[PDB]
Amino acid sequence: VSSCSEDWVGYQRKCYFISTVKRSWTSAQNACSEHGATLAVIDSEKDMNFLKRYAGREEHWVGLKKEPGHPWKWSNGKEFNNWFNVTGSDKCVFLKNTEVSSMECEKNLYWICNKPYK
């Protein structure tokens, strides 16, 4: 048995899936959830650097969302402590090779899921 599917990317004890189609943050989260994953949680600078580089030119949703009145929360429930900057003031976070920013959640963007190694 192996830690990740052959069509997922394994890095630093997490398996990643990068989508081939664009959908809303909520639909993407649902799609990750169908595969025992969440929209990507980023634990380290290593994880961030890998994610931004690979994302490339195109915006990709990741597992971070900010609701007015609540702290920033990762999709696995872990509170986010703002160790990286997120520009803009929209609820849903995306990244790409040159930015980590925010956009309206209903916008159709590519996405990235992750889950622990099996």
Next chain:
Amino acid sequence: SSCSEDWVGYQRKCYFISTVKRSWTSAQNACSEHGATLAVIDSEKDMNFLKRYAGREEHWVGLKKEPGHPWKWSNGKEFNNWFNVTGSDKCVFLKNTEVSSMECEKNLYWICNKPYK
């Protein structure tokens, strides 16, 4: 299991992206130190992954042409020219928007790969 620490697993191969720029030969030797070779590309999936993994900077991969011999992959498989290598040099590099060639003695980042079981 999986690829080792600091390696990336995709399509039953483990990949490693360098943090320093070196000649193609020095790069191949560095890969060899870790049971790998400069990246070999078996499929369109591998190619698309490698170009994305490489990002914006040029990275050496395991394709090289000795001017009296055909093109050959670092794992011994002859290259069937399923993609074009532009430029005018012996050693192949790629990045997210390009596969081309450069003088082998030039210092570029590199990507290693190895199968895995």
